[model samples]
Structures are given as structure tokens and as C-alpha cells.
Target chain A: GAMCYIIAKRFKKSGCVALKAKRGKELADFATDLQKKLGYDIQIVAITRPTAYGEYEPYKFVNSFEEFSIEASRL
Target chain B: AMYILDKIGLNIEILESLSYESKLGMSFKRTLSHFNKEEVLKEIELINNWYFSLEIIDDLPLDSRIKSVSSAKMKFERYYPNATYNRVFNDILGFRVICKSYDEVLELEKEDKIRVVDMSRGKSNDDGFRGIHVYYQRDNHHYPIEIQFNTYYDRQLNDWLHDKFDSSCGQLLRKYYENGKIKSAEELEEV
Candidate 1:
């Protein structure tokens, strides 16, 4: 329930996309779009959640310009 | 340098050639004479006071700068107010008196004589250097006051033959006994 609340809040506060492990493809597309818009390098990775057995979980891991831009936007 | 001596009340006459020994003798004689005078004592006191108040204080931690304070002791001697010893032995005696007196004076200044900036010790040919030195500040002036102490052996063997022999003769002698060509008095007489 907490995770659902966090995802809903992120989407409502900023038009930014949110996704679960099943939406790995959509998350990759979002990361690529963000990297091209920011004009620098970006990368993303996924790993299994230790609590969830037999699951390949996807998580946003922004890099370089995208990472810096996200932090700058926050400031 | 000769001109400087003339300015300081010493008469000088040009000579064809002055032997190093003779020149040393003259200098020693004059220094001894000057120290023997009552006026010189006053000067020595002035110098001592200046050393304590000005020289020593300005040069704190002199141990880092010099070999030792005893190597810088001031030897005050008077040879009939007109004659002074030209040898290190006499110089060492003078230094002894000055060091002893300085220790007494330092004690008067504070209960700790060693706390005073001045220092003294026995002569050492091995070191090739021995004296008393102090640092202080007085009357807006500051510098180190150094008084050398040496034995007759040092004067004859080292000072007299400084130019002829290497500067590090003393150190060398200490490191390697009987290595230098310089012979002792007994050997010279035997020859």
C-alpha cells in the first residue's frame, strides 16, 4: 500500500511516469527519452528484490546528465 | 678589515708580509689588553646585558640553530690592559669566568639558571668548536651574542693552522685518530 501511495504521489506531483516491474519496457523508454532531452549520457539497470523471490525487478538508475538534471530540477 | 680596526683606535703600519702567527699574536695581544681594562669590564657588562635583554630573547630555541650554548660563551680576559693572550687556553679561562658569572646573573633574574638563554660546557677539539652563546632583546635591539672558548691545543693546532689544514680537521681527527700529518708537540720535538 505504501509503494502504491509513493507511485501515485510521484505521478501526481510531477507529470513524470511511474511503473512497476511488469512495466520494464515503458520505464526503459522513459529513461531513453529523458536522456535525449537532456543531451547527455544515461543508463538504467534492474535487479531482483531481495524480499521477492524468483522475480526480475526493474528500477530507475539515471546516469550522468539525466542524473545531474534530475538533481538540478529538484534544487 | 684593517681599516675597521684603525677606526676602532688601533694603530696600523703596512708591512711587506705579515706571518699568520705574528698577526694572530698581535690580535691576541690587543684583545687581551682591551679586556684587562676597567672600561672593558663596563663594556662586557653592557654586552652581557644587551645579550640577555636583546640577543637571547630574539633568538628563541637557539639549540636548533647552534651546536650548543657553551660553544657560544663570551670569554672576558685582560692581559695588563694592553696585552691579551693569543692562545685558546687563555680564551677558555676567560670563557669559564664569563659563563660562571652569567649563570650567577641568570639566577638573579629568575630562580632557574638553566632557563636563561645562555649556555656553556667544556671544550671539545673533536667538535672543532666550543663557546657560549645567548639570545635576548633589549632597548629595541636583538641578536645572538657568541663567545668562543678553546684550549691552547685548539689555538695552536687549529686556529694557527686553519688555512694550511682542512677546515674539518678537528672532526677528522676525532673520527680517525693519528691520521692527519699534523704532529703533536712530543712528536715535533722528537723529530
Candidate 2:
């Protein structure tokens, strides 16, 4: 997603803990992997590219992984 | 006030002990702090240097003026819960330069020194907002400041829309514009 590209750049520039990896079978896998690697609990804040709502664009604000999957599929 | 705290300086330990709202305020401050006294002083120096160094300022027509200055609004609503420091806010500090005409806006856009980080000039943004938004930065500064360029007419329309419409109305107007259902708000007889 184009919005995700911006987010990725922001994450890198801002020095946040974020991973840019291959798309997983499930979105939870990424969070699980991050937490396992860091040895702590990780909260998935936003999952971008779930739908075509203008509200979600430019910033791709998605609440849950389910929403992301649902929206991606719908598109 | 959180804004006042930024000016005078506040204790981190004390701020940490405060309520959720206060904590977010403190966090916002800390986020900025991590990026400004040192930050603020540097900002002032950079701004002072940048203003005098502007070729556009020297060539300004008699009617043109620097319109407004603002800092980021530090409220609970403004903070993005998901984003980190750099992505948190667009306009930590902002200035609006009211040019005489739309042409001046285009001229400033092409200026070599005024490298824009992100801009909205000829086309309106998604919200039917139009202006030249420059995230102005120099080599010395840690973070960029927002500088908006607009003609008087442009500023007038933008401010009017801002004052007149709530969020939903603005969204509907933007949707209408996108759909090409109407050209301008004046044409929206049904809406």
C-alpha cells in the first residue's frame, strides 16, 4: 500500500520498532514474531491497506488485522 | 498549561505521575524534546536565519504580508495513538505567507532554497483545501517547520470554509468535488 510506504518511512525516520517483512499468512504472525524476537508483548497499533475509505487513505489507518484482511480482499 | 510547560520547562518525573491526559501531554512534550531550550533556541535561531535569508521576502509586493504563526495544538485528539514522534504532527511550528496573487505562490514553489517536504498547491487536498504547504527545513534544524503560501483570495476561501463547515460537512463537500457532482459550494443548491 502507498500509505504503508509513508508509514514505513516514518517508522524508520522516527526510530520506532517496526518490521518490513514478507506478507504473512496471517497478520498476527508478524506481531507474534516481533514479540518473540524482542521477548516481550507487542501491540499492533495500525494495520494499513484494508479498504478504500478516503478516511483510511494518505495514512491507511486500520484498527484490526481482520479489517485489513477483509478490506484487502474486498478491494 | 502544557504549552506553558514547554516554555518554562517541566519535571519529567512529576509529569509522569499525572493523569492520562497529562501523561499524553508530557509524552508529546518529550517527543518534541527528544527531537528542542536547545530545541527551542535552535528553532529561533534557524527561523531568524531562514527569514532574513529568503529571496522571496525581499521581492515581496507591497500588499503581501506574513499572515499568521502557530504551533501544533497539543490536545488528546491531535495526537496519533499509532504513530511515533516524527509522524505525530505535521505543523509543530507553522507560518503563513500571504502573497499578492496565485502566481507568487507558484514562484515561491520553484525557489531553490524553499525545498518543500510535502505540498498542496494547484490541486486541493482530499478535504477540498487548497494552499501551498511547505515543510521547510534546513541542514541545521532537527525537524522541519510548516510554511504555507497562499494568495489573499485563497486564504479567504480556506479560512471561510474552515469557519463555516464542521468535519462531516467538509467531508461531504470533498466527496461532491471528487464525484464531480458540483463545481463549487455555491452550486450546491440541493446539498
Candidate 3:
């Protein structure tokens, strides 16, 4: 969760839209508009490090559009 | 046709050459340990209690009182877009000292407890954000640590505005850089 927050904070200036689950459609639309206007793709990625020790695992690109679509559908 | 920047006037070569250093990441980790030292923690504790205590009930938890460590990627992305690391990355490991009032915030600027390498008060942007960023060097460390002094009232306004307008601000800046048109959050809100 801290990692996700870090990622969001980092990209907040680079078109990372923060939205509640109820506002998932707004997030999707804003991302789409940003890409259309600026020709920049904003990809969501996640990585996890264990609380105890060890190295952080390799990050994976989480499908932002699909995730938002599912959230919109559920809502 | 090469899309050369005209009105924006930003150097494409500089943007292309921007990079994140692994050594910066190591320094960030080391800075965390440095702040965690008992002496440094005590220093922070003393400042947190300096001036009239703002706490009506209990003091804010220690972790919440300090600035979060900005990752290497964060330094590269948020700041490196238009400036060099030396100019923008002072807050990578820092403290957010919340003051009771604007006057208190300004008073902290006069405190000689730490060596202030540079100080910036208030905002240059139109957003009217009020805060003091004191960049100081302690222990002769290579990095100049940042201490942000903000009043509780301005802090809430700053937080609210950032939460609501961060993406819009990003879009505004991106458009200005690429398309040579400056816009405001209010204009984006009207869309």
C-alpha cells in the first residue's frame, strides 16, 4: 500500500489521476483524455517488499483501464 | 517532420538526458537511517515541541510529523522534467514541521538551531500556498535536508487543493510544455 501511494505521488504531476472507486469512470476518462491530448501513456505498476526483509519483487504493470472498467461495472 | 518545441523553448536534449541514479537511492536509504539516529530523533522531538504546543489532546504520532522519503523515480519524474536534481531534490528526505500559525512558521525561519543553506517562503505559483522550506546541512552531510514549516490552516488548504487539482495541474503543465498554452485548474474544472 505504501508502494502504491509512492507510485501515485510520483506520477501525480505526470497525469496520475486520483479517484475514489465510485469515481472510476472519471479516472478512466481523464487518463484517456491525457493520452489523447499529450500522447503520453500512463501505466499503473505495483511492486511488493516483505515487511520483514528481503528485496522488493519485480514490479508488474497492473492494467489500469481494465481495473477501472471492472470497478465501474461493479459500481 | 521533427516536432521542435517553439514557444515552450525547453531543450529536448536535456530532457532526453535526464536519468535516475542508483547512488541517490542509496543516499535516500542512508538519510532515513540518519534521521532515525537517537540524536537526530531527539532534535526533531525538541522542534515538534518548540513554541506553543498545537496539541489540544495528544501530540501527532512521530511518523506523521516528518516528511516522506521521495524515491529515485519520484525525484526524476516530479522535478527532473524542467530542472536539475541539485535544484529540485532537496526534499527527498526532509521534515514537515507544522506550526500553530503563519507567524510561528516565520519565527522558525529565524531559529539558528540548524544551518539554513537556503530558504523559500510562500509560493511563486498562483495557488497562494503558504509555507517555508528551509534547506539546511547537518553533520556536514553532502545532502542539504529540507525542513518545511506550514501552519495547520494552510496545511489543510494545501492538502485539499493538491488532492483535488494534482492531475489537472499536471495536465496544465504538460499542455504548456508541449503545446505552448498556459491554463489553470479552474479552466480544467469547467470542462
Candidate 4:
């Protein structure tokens, strides 16, 4: 049972969407919207976020590029 | 293309480029333990010149206060797309000032060349906070120092917050959930 706050941003040298999640229909719609905004089939990826000693609320789960998208697809 | 960026940016060439070391906000925040110690003492000394018995707790370290570089850059691009790297990144330095007498506060107001950066007075519970936050900075400063002048009750509340919880992340949840406590995972049945 893991819940993460979905965070996204555009970096000129980086990316516009990073949806780190598992497969879920809810995830598909969000990613589709992001593709339209970017005007291209944006790359989706998972991001690795570290959790400090003991499960902390502030960083219980983190997200990044490819891993972020893989996870984002999950609902 | 936006697609092109994702592949390379995720690579070590970008994410681990080591260029972030030059970012003013990163370099400054990394050395906050040293900078804050000297600057806070300097600030206190300036105040002490006018009065005595003013207590303070300068507790926020860079680890606790820094807004991540990626986050900062994103926020800037949203509003000021053409801003420079220096303008995009900023850090925070904060302290809780407890004064038994208001004389020094009034005197602090009288000092010349006090460049007040941001000041909020007679505030409501903005972020579960209660104090007059007076943010100021010195010449050649990279970031602003937020000095919180607190009432006696506010002083106790801050103390309680620190003693009981990790003040960094706990403040949000304290204010977010209104009804029940989530002590066990099974109990988290609703929002």
C-alpha cells in the first residue's frame, strides 16, 4: 500500500512528464494529456526516490524519469 | 523534441553532471551549517547592541529548508520562463525569536539601512504558524533570512512542535487531516 504525490515538470534538457506508476486506466488518461501538451510522444520513465531511515512521511516514496512513468501507469 | 530530452536527461550526463555544484543556491545551502552560525550570531549581536535578554532558536538547516533545484527551476519556468539560473534558485534561513520585552523589537525598527525583504504582520494561521515573520538580508546575500518574532504562546507551540515531531514534514499532516488519527495502516480507510 504505497501512495505518492505525482510531481511533473519540464526541463529544457530533461523532460515534461515523469509518471512513475504501475498500469492503471487512470494513469493512461493523464499521460495522454501530457503528450498533447508537448506535441510529441513524450518519453515516459521511472524515477528512483530515496526514503530516509524508517518510513518517513516527507519522503516515504520518491519519483523520477522512467521509473516515474512505469509507476504512474498504475492506479 | 520533449521525447529526446527524457532519454538523455535521465542519463548520468545530465542528472549527475556535477554542474549543480556551481548553482548559487546549492553551494550556499550546502554550507549553511557554517554560514548560518556566523550570520545568525552577527544578527543577534546587532540586536544585542540595542537590548538584552532576547532569546532565539536558529534551528532550520539547509537539509530541512532547501527547495530542491529541480523544483525551484520548475517553479521559475512556470512564471518567469526566461529567468537565469541564479534567479531561479533560492534558499531559506529561518529563526524563532522570543523576546520578553518588545523594546528591542521597536528599537530594531529604528535602525538605519535595515533592508526589509518580506514582512507579514498580525497574521492568521498561515501554515499553522503564528508570528510576525520579518525576512531580511544583507548586502551580497544569496538568500533571505526569515526571523520569526513570536508571542509567549507561540514560543511554547514551536517548542512543542519541535519536541514532539520532525518539524520538517510533520507540519503538513498536522493541518491536513481533520477527523481521525492514522496510527495503524489498517485504520487509513478514508481521506
Candidate 5:
């Protein structure tokens, strides 16, 4: 039972850390790569936080991906 | 004082030490020292030579003072001809000063040289806790000085929100901060 408890705790901590690190790096890289690939004119902004209190969470698509393409063009 | 005077186009030497007790008093002393500094005085003279420069009303009598003369003329031109424009300009300037440096206060003692005549604190309906007022007889000539002060809470909140938001966002934040349930005074320190 002790062995099982230790394993579970380790796994939980690792998972949480991995998730946090991934979120941070991915957002940063996404901003950089998007800027480099699309040039200065294309702006990608993250308006919502990962731990927002409202109806959404991290990386959740606010609208259909198709809407993003149209929105980019309209801008 | 140097810092404050510097904002108004006065170039003065910054002293490292002053005998003033309180931080507010020290600030005033520093300001006065800047005026007495040789380099600063020269620069003032230079500026005065070309521009219509005279000792401020508080420093000189109005009848004999060029600075007071210009101020009076401008005040008349801006406010007298039309009371409406004067009121509008007053409101605009009031907002500007409150927004700019509400955290700063002109500390004048009750019986001291400077006496505060009228004052208005930022309302629950307004942006933040800003103190705006007109001071009278502060200096030698008994001229009045208009002042605005902000509490630490007001300053930090305004600065943070202003930095994070655009103009529209700023307006929204101001409104929200004013009307919304803020952290209690006790909780503020913990935060």
C-alpha cells in the first residue's frame, strides 16, 4: 500500500508539472513561430489565461478554426 | 521638490541630503534647494530672459510681479471671457492631474505657511482615491497652490490597470475598480 501510494503521488506531481511546463513553452513558442512564419503583419494574441474563471480554459478554441482564417483576412 | 519642479521645466541641482524630517518635508526641501542651486538659478534666468518670466506670485507681490501678471492675464483669457470654457478646462485639467500623479500629496501643516482652503477626495463613484484641492497662503506672498494626492492603493491600482489595458480597457478598469467590490482594507496588505 505504501509503495502504491508513493508511485501515485510521483505520477500526479510529474503530470501537473509537465502540464504547466507544456502550457508555458507552447504559448511562448506559438507566439514566436507564428510571428516568424507570418511576418510582422500577422498578430496572434492569447486573450484568455490557462486558469480562467469563466466558461473557457487553456488552449480551447474560442470559435471554429474556419472563423480564425476569416477573421485574419478581415483584419 | 526638485522632482516636482523638474516636471514644470525647472532645471535644478539634486541634493543628496536635507535636514527635513518627514519624507514630504524632505521633498519640499529638495525642491527649495534646487531653486537656490547656481546652475539651476542660471538656467532659470536664461529661460526668463527670452520668455515672459517673473517670480511666481507666492514669491512676489502680484502688482510688482511679472509671473503673476502673465498668470492673471492667462487666467482671465481662459476663464473670464467665457465661464463655460473655463469650467470645461478646469474639469479636464482636474482629471489630468488626478490621473497623472494622484499618489503624491502636498503636505501642508494646519498653521504652517501653507493652508488648504478647499479639497475634494476621489468619490466612490470616481476612478480611484484621488485628493484634489486648492491651497492658500503657502509661501511668502500668500498665493494659493492647487494640489492632488493619491493613496498607495490608488496609485498601484491605477498604474497596474493602465499598463495592462488599452484606452477602452483602461476606462473599463477604472469603472470596474470604482464600483466593484475591492479587497477590504485589511486584505489589501496581505494581497
Candidate 6:
């Protein structure tokens, strides 16, 4: 079974950040670790989940960060 | 209402209880991953200051100040044939700034990694979407921030358009954006 929880963190300079990380111990920690060092506010504004339409994008009328990462990172 | 709650000065216990309140809103990816709680507030300080100061300075009540992002890259890829998550063709983080009019909209000018693409007709289009987009990039970040500017009326319509064909229009606008001309929409179309 494939399972990885992707989350969209919100920052002032940036908006929602949807990123998928390896399904490790704590789901949000690794990414937050990298985010906090940036000397910026990166709040988790969104979290990824399963949808009716495949790995659908969770949006507020929207853009794509996380899945794009998963896609790019895979390469 | 949430902003007002902050203005009135409520304790964290109550704020967290009532915040989001959306059944659709889910928890963070972890159950017990801990971080400095105050860090979140400090992160939002700029926004709080801007919201509070804007009103205090002169009541420039924001029509809408949504902190959002382009979380779905695959959907973006579908919308934009030429879109790639890089400095040149990325649209990852986005801030949708919707105001009352162009005059009011002008007050919201500002960013880097922020490439602005304008398609506003000074009026709404047939589809009821009209506004400008500013897209740009930051160092070490995976995607460029996309800030869209629109009038209040257009904003209302755009809210419905987020999932539909709205994003598809990005690359089309980018095509015009890269044209590097100061022409109106019609003028650009002719070229």
C-alpha cells in the first residue's frame, strides 16, 4: 500500500506549500525542520488527503506545490 | 470574524477552539510532532501588522486577503501546457489580492519571485474573471509565488473559478506576459 501524507504549509512571503515527504516517524517534522531555518513563517495552511478525483489538489481557488514536488523529486 | 477575535484580544485556548472550525479542515500531518507554538504567531506578525495597521492608518479595509498556495502541481501541469516548477515557469505559492477597484487595487502593489501578469479589462470578462497576476521566485524555494490582483466583483466570480478553467488561463497570460509589451489585452491579441 502506498501512503504518504502531503501537507501545504503557509508562509507570509509564500502562500500554500504542498509537499510530500517520505512516510517516516512524524509526518510534518522533516519539512518543518527545513522550513523553520529559512527565518520565515511557514504555517501549515493545508494538508493533503485522498479525494474522489485521484490525488486531487486541495485548494482555495489554487496553485500546485506539493504534488509538483513529488513529481519533480521522483526524477 | 477570526481577525476581529484577534483584535478584541482573546486567549489562545479559545482562539484555537474556534479557528478553522471546518469539518473539511483536517489536522496537520502529524499527531504529536512538536514545534515552538509562538513561532507560528511570529510568522504571521507581518500579516497581523498589515491588517491592523492598514485600518488604523486610514481604514483601507481589505476586500480579501487570502493566504493560499498552488498545492496541486499536477493540476497545474494540466492547466498550463508549458508550466514547469522552476524560476521561469513556476506557480507554486500564490496570494490572491482582491480589492474594490483599480484605485483600491493599486494600493496593494508589492514582491520578488513575483511575476505579475495582468488580464483585467478594467472590467470583468464574459466569464466574469478579470484581474492581474504577479508571479516570481525566491532562493532555495521550489516554486514561484503567484499573486493575483482583482476587483471585488471579479474576486467574487473568481472564487467559483478556482477549480475550473481559471488556471488554464495562466499560461495564456504568461504568453502575453513574455511578449514584453505594454499593450492592452486586445492589442496583445492582435500580435
What local distance difference test score does each model get? 0.27, 0.35, 0.33, 0.32, 0.28, 0.35
Per-prediction TM-score to the true structure, in the order listed: 0.21, 0.33, 0.35, 0.28, 0.24, 0.32
TM-score of 5: 0.24
Interface RMSD of each: 39.4, 22.2, 18.5, 21.8, 27.0, 14.1
- Candidate with better TM-score, 1 vs 3: 3
lDDT of 6 by residue, B72-162 (tens): 3223334343333243323322334444455533332452323445567532333435687654443322233344566655553353334
Give the Å error, residue A42, model 1.
77
Q: Over the stretch A1-75, how does candidate 3's per-residue lDDT look in tens digits?
A: 022111122233433222222112343234333323332222221111121111112222234645543332221
lDDT (tens digit, per residue) of candidate 2 on B45-159: 3333333223332222211111111122232124434433434443433444554544444443454434454334335334556667654333222333455566555554464
What would the per-residue lDDT of candidate 2 be over residues A1-75, giving only the tens digit for each residue?
212211111211221222222222233343333323332121122222222112222343345544443333232
- Candidate 5, residue B124: the lDDT equals 44
Q: Write the per-residue lDDT of candidate 3 for residues B34-121, one digit (tens) a residue.
A: 2223333233222222211222111222111212222333344554334533444444334345545444334434534233332233
Per-residue lDDT of model 4, residues B14-40, tens digit only: 212211222122333233332233333
Worst 10 residues of 4 chain B by lDDT: B54-63
Poorly placed runs, candidate 6 (over 4 Å) = A1-27, A30-75, B1-89, B103-113, B122-127, B139-142, B161-191
lDDT of 4 by residue, A6-72 (tens): 3333323222233334323354344444433443223221122222111112222335535654433
Query: What does candidate 5's lDDT look like per residue over B28-147, in tens digits?
Result: 222232222333223322322211211121121111111112222234344443342212111111101222443233433333533442233444454433344433222331122333
Proportion of the native interface contacts kept in model 4: 0.00
- TM-score of candidate 4 versus the correct structure, residues matched by position: 0.28
Model 4 whole-model lDDT (C-alpha atoms): 0.32
Comparing to the true complex, what docking class would candidate 6 get?
incorrect
Candidate 5 Cα outliers beyond 4 Å, as residue runs = A1-75, B1-76, B81-109, B112-129, B132-142, B157-172, B178-191
Task: For residue B146, give model 2's deviation from the true position in Å.
Answer: 2.8
What is residue A19's positional error in candidate 4, in angstroms? 29
